[PDB]
UniProtKB/Swiss-Prot annotation, chain A:
It is found in: Cytoplasm. This is Dipeptidyl peptidase 8. It comes from the Eukaryota. Dipeptidyl peptidase that cleaves off N-terminal dipeptides from proteins having a Pro or Ala residue at position 2. Acts as a key inhibitor of caspase-1-dependent monocyte and macrophage pyroptosis in resting cells by preventing activation of NLRP1 and CARD8. Sequesters the cleaved C-terminal part of NLRP1 and CARD8, which respectively constitute the active part of the NLRP1 and CARD8 inflammasomes, in a ternary complex, thereby preventing their oligomerization and activation. GO terms for cellular component: cytoplasm; cytosol. Its EC number is 3.4.14.5.
Length: 811, 815
């Protein structure tokens, strides 16, 4: 064998090649036409290219010889991120820039043929308005956030009112702290729980003959949370912004629950508002809870629910919270004494389902609730990894029992006093595969036919196929998407059509509309049909040779998957240099059968310079159950590279053109962390390491993430020590050219402190580094000029220290 | 000629190279002479001084005669037993006062109670203060009393009655940064970094006697209000915490601190106990009495304690004033408006500030520590000696006499004073020195005045710009400036208070720093004439250092008119036929001369270590440097960055003709602070000359630097749009090389002077202009690199960078 060498370009010549070589539809919704005679069945509304609202028409019959391309009809007159709806009126609502707008299409006021004009919601608010949500009960009321407080605005009467008076926007950060109706830093980053207020879909009637609308919300008080100083984006000022960051082992925000009551008289104006806190403290009612993972209302509207975790995140609880638990707020001490006794004892919180595990609770969106079937029962579907070790739907019926705790007593509650008995727990699915419940995946639930649809890993972990099965008497799981592709699917609310954003490794991404059929003898059975196309493909894209997906049976008893990009125009005899992209952290799988030319376009660019690009999903990656993910608990850093080195040596034996005297590693966030761990642990295997936003020291990262995977720092001092590359600075090479550090100077998530503190110890260890800073970038890179420079320095750094003979000369 | 290429060592090898090279390796200061007054005794004087074994007070015995056959070494008798930066002394009682860490201690020696023959135990001054007590000062009138600062307020403490008392209630320590930020007795950031004025309060040297038998002491003090000053954030040394400390930094063009004089009258009874302390504001605002003044440069008191004096600059630093301020100008602080109005009218209109000297210049005023007031001979006049470049363009001594006239300004009348209303007439202004050379007045250089013989001793550049020398001259009939120090060495000097001895710390390019005592005699026929004699050695030289070839001081007649000096490090073992890679070291900014006849082996050791590995090392002092007059220095006024490289190149090209071993196709440049600024400018302006540029803590953008410096040399930003733009490398990022392995930035992450945002914002524009950089951060370091482990890693990454991108053949291959 004789080593291949890559093109020694200049700096500007590399900028040439990048500069030269150069979003999908989403948020679908279905509305049927109520059309006695006419042709079209449905009219859908969705978001795509500024990025705004489109609509389309679904024909009742198609010429099955030809392929129907559906038309992108524009819904608006002239981006848009997330919209709301109310079918009973047709009332839309959405955000675009600072302003909020509304139209009508479907309901009592017709189907518009042409693009209807966007009518604005006017305001008496001094600041930007965030997170607009429609009330289902009243189609005319909406709610939104303004300076960490909830307002409501009426888009016909033009009547506005501030509901929560918590955040004093004139007072500064250090003294203020509180919020009401927004999620904190942790709950948005680590739990994808972006909103913090939820409308009630019903309204109680008053003695005057009107209604009372309801809004649930949490009240965070971040007073004990650590203040941290990130540098301000305007480097001109030479100042830093103070923002709250609950570091591992420190206090999280003082969470507690609240609820509103808006009396609307017969005319439609607000009578009088009542703001309501809990009957007792959050510590006493919900004992040992330290996070509010999700919340919302029952379709009934009688109970408001919330999923609640303990601090270590090893105890999920689903609790029902009836509005009769809340009382109005009062400064008068003995008036509240009277308010508490008038509320009964039997009106009590109800833990309808508790579960534990010695790994962790992965929080998911899936929680369908059925209408109140029997009197003191609640039928509901829920997902859980706890039982089998894999996420499966369990139909549960919990007895809504009167509590053994009476607050009148004076005594304090025991741990089991709000635990409901279980009538049943029917496992709807089962196996060595999971149901998906994050990133827009959930469950479409037919209640007449009594079915349930879902995404999962049944056919393969590499493909996210659509599946269907009954919830009453469950059994066989019917696949609804063609093999070889991966699918992020959306089913109709009427269960007759479904749309499937799909791609694979060779062919780019598309979208397709599909019709579901069902024999009239048997509701259970369902078959699909290729109905239409919403977006045609980009074809075998020019200059793009993808990687062939490989798997290998690991020495740890797992089928570890991987992507292998081979050098474009392959030379037998001449072995090539090798580069290894990586993330290998929780909540993320890189290797699946999907088009990796969109986001991972550069990997292909490296393949067309003579770099062997390899990618592996080590133990810890998602979509493969709790036991596979759970491998690294308390042991982040320690195992991951050994899986990568193993999977690399499978490619080394099979394909000997991979030169293991020229091995490079690169990644972002956790990816950069492992890239440092690679060079630190395996100096012998790995030549160069390029660390993007490296987590160098786990005591600096937030609670929500780190306590989940590593526990509380005090009870795992070694796991933190071993998992923190900053401590182990002496273990790095005494050889330059092998350690590049890349980091955004304004990083809120993986603080630049990680890099600076690592560098501090690297300096006193006497260890060389190379370093680039992108001073205008936060966590990722969200500016063209920075991104251009990153890629430009990446390819040149590899060229100068891995690929070409000048790099071979440096040793 | 064929190229030379340096030997490639690894990172691991060079670390050992630099370690071993350093495997080997503070002088005395703050001297004082006290007479033994022992006719029978063998010693005339005893000298006290600060030095290291731990920096502390020592002493030696100065004999009345010596064995002139051999060299007498002086025994360093330690005064103490338990770091002392500075110390105070009262001649009358023999009382030492000095901060040492947290505590403020005192001992007695050499006064009326005699001279000890062993160490003395330091006696702590006890305290109710929670925090560390900074800036101790003995009251000259009463050595029982002292003053100090605590949380930016003046406290006084008696060291026998144990009485303590806070004198100012300005800064409240429990309240945070933004909501408070006032101070009394303390010098602000700008006054310490740019003007080297470290104290902000001054004891009135004499005591007034009350009718009862007690006495009044006085402390003049500066009261600063930093409310309007820019609050800048720098990262906290505790990286652990991931926080940033706030402090006040007047950026170029922004608000400076708002200042004023205040006086504290301390009435003490006949027992030594505080009766009452009155705090006194000025009778009119500082804005009105001192029109135009931005900085209180220096302050103090006349010998008699009759007037407080003050040296005052306007914001542009073109106008300087010396103003006498009577204590009668200060009236008590009264909230009661009817009471104040009476206290205003109590003071006569005839009492008024006295601008006893005023001068302008179109270049700038360099502040200095030379100012000597005489005994008051005539009752409505004052004599003094002062230094100035404003007359000839070179810093010289002038014996000014000023007439303390009554002002035409009466406060009574109600209006504001005219610009000339406080200006005294100058009765005479005798020039004591003159020529194209300067007297020195900073970094401890100062005059000593023999008031009996009517002479003045001083340091200057008369013989050479490369050698500081002591001189003596009359101030009555000034003429022959007699040199006292021996030629061939440069001299930092100290003269005895009795003018019969002088100490020198001297060195030269070959010989390390030696410290010698010399005795000053005079012949009976002419007391104007003075002659020295080698009396003893205080500190002996370390002797020419092993493996240190010192450089040679060259010079060239520049095309700009001036005789520019430099230093040349020839590579060790020259190979005729082979041409070496060149490394240009630079500061090349104001207030600094690198090139002079001193031993550069201590500080600039690695310039030699570069030469031993086969690098030519050049250092040039371009137009802007100190010690060559104001005209020379002024060169880059409004033009920083624009002219310095032209001088550096010209010197480099001068060396290239005289020596062909300079490979001009492989030349690098390196420097710190202003050195790093010009190192960036070298690459930005002269790509063709300079392969690599290694820039330490570089000033990238002049609006981000402080008022006191930046406006001195560049004026107000509004008044010099172009000079700022052209002088700011951050604003000209597009003009950098697209070739990598040329630009290297170094910067201390915790820097207070040249904030790291200079470097970060340069990178911001280098990125969005697609230009490559290399970077090293030193996260535990401020402006200069302090921690030894951090310094070694800089020295290492310097040599390796030079090796891979300039020196060795692997660098040549990279094209």
């Amino acid at each position: 064998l004789e080593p291949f060498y890559v093109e020694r370009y200049s700096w500007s010549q590399l900028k040439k090649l990048l500069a030269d070589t150069r979003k999908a539809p989403h948020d679908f919704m279905f509305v049927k036409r109520n059309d006695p005679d006419g042709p079209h069945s449905d009219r859908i509304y969705y978001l795509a290219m500024e990025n705004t609202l489109f609509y389309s028409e679904i024909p009742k019959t198609i010429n099955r010889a030809a392929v129907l391309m559906l038309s992108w009809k524009p819904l608006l007159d002239l981006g848009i991120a997330s919209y709301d709806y109310h079918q009973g009126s047709g009332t839309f609502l959405f955000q675009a820039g600072s302003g909020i707008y509304h139209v009508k299409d479907g309901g009592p006021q017709g189907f518009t043929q042409q693009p209807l004009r966007p009518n604005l919601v006017e305001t008496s608010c001094p600041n930007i308005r965030m997170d607009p949500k429609l009330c289902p009960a009243d189609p005319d009321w909406i709610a939104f956030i303004h300076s960490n407080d909830i307002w409501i605005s009426n888009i016909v009467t033009r009547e506005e009112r501030r509901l929560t008076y918590v955040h004093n926007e004139l007072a500064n950060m250090e003294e203020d702290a509180r919020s009401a109706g927004v999620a904190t830093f942790v709950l948005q980053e680590e739990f994808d729980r972006y909103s913090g207020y939820w409308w009630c879909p019903k309204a109680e009637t008053t003695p005057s003959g009107g209604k009372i609308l309801r809004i649930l919300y949490e009240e965070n008080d971040e007073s004990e949370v650590e203040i941290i100083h990130v540098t301000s984006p305007m480097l001109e000022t030479r100042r830093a912004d103070s923002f709250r960051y609950p570091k591992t082992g420190t206090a999280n925000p003082k969470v507690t629950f609240k609820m509103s009551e808006i009396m609307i008289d017969a005319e439609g104006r607000i009578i009088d508002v009542i703001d309501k806190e809990l009957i007792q403290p959050f510590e006493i009612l919900f004992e040992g809870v330290e996070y509010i993972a999700r919340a919302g209302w029952t379709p009934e509207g009688k109970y408001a629910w919330s999923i609640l975790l303990d601090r270590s995140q090893t105890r999920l609880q689903i609790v029902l919270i009836s509005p009769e638990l809340f009382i109005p707020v009062e400064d008068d001490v003995m008036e509240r004494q009277r308010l508490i006794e008038s509320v009964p004892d039997s009106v009590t919180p109800l833990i309808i389902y508790e579960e534990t595990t010695d790994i962790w609770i992965n929080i998911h969106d899936i929680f369908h609730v059925f209408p109140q079937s029997h009197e003191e029962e609640i039928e509901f579907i829920f997902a859980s990894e706890c039982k089998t070790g894999f996420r499966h739907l369990y139909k549960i019926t919990s007895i809504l029992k009167e509590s053994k705790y009476k607050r009148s007593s004076g005594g304090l509650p025991a741990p089991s006093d709000f635990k409901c008995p279980i009538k049943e727990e029917i496992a709807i699915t089962s196996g060595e595969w999971e149901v998906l419940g994050r990133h827009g995946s959930n469950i479409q639930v037919d209640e007449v036919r009594r079915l349930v649809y879902f995404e999962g890993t049944k056919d393969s972990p590499l493909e996210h196929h659509l599946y269907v099965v009954s919830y009453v008497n469950p059994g066989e799981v019917t696949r609804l998407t063609d093999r070889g592709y991966s699918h992020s699917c959306c089913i109709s609310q009427h269960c007759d059509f479904f749309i499937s954003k799909y791609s694979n490794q060779k062919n780019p991404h598309c979208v397709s509309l599909y019709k579901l059929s069902s024999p009239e003898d048997d509701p259970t059975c369902k078959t699909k049909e290729f109905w239409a196309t919403i977006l045609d493909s980009a074809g075998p894209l020019p200059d793009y040779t993808p990687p062939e997906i490989f798997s290998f049976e690991s020495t740890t008893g797992f089928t570890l998957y991987g992507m292998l990009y081979k050098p474009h125009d392959l030379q037998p005899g001449k072995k090539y240099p090798t580069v290894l992209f990586i993330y290998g952290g929780p909540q993320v799988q890189l290797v699946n059968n999907r088009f990796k030319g969109v986001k991972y376009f550069r990997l292909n660019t490296l393949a067309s310079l003579g770099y062997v690009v390899v990618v592996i999903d080590n133990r810890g990656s998602c979509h493969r159950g709790l036991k596979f993910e759970g491998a690294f608990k308390y042991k982040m850093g320690q195992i991951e590279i050994d899986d990568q080195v193993e999977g690399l040596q499978y490619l080394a034996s099979r394909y000997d053109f991979i030169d293991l005297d020229r091995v490079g590693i690169h990644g972002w966030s956790y990816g950069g962390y492992l890239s440092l761990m690679a060079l630190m642990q395996r100096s012998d295997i790995f030549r160069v390491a390029i660390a993007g936003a490296p987590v160098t020291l786990w005591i600096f990262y937030d609670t929500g993430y780190t306590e989940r995977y590593m526990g509380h720092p005090d009870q795992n001092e070694q796991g933190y020590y071993l998992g923190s590359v900053a401590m182990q600075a002496e273990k790095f090479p005494s050889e330059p050219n092998r350690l590049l550090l890349l980091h955004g100077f304004l990083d809120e998530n993986v603080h630049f402190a990680h890099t600076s503190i690592l560098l501090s110890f690297l300096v006193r260890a006497g260890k060389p580094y190379d370093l680039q800073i992108y001073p205008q970038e936060r966590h990722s890179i969200r500016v063209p000029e920075s991104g251009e420079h990153y890629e430009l320095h990446l390819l040149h750094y590899l060229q100068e220290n891995l690929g070409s003979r000048i790099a071979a000369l440096k040793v």
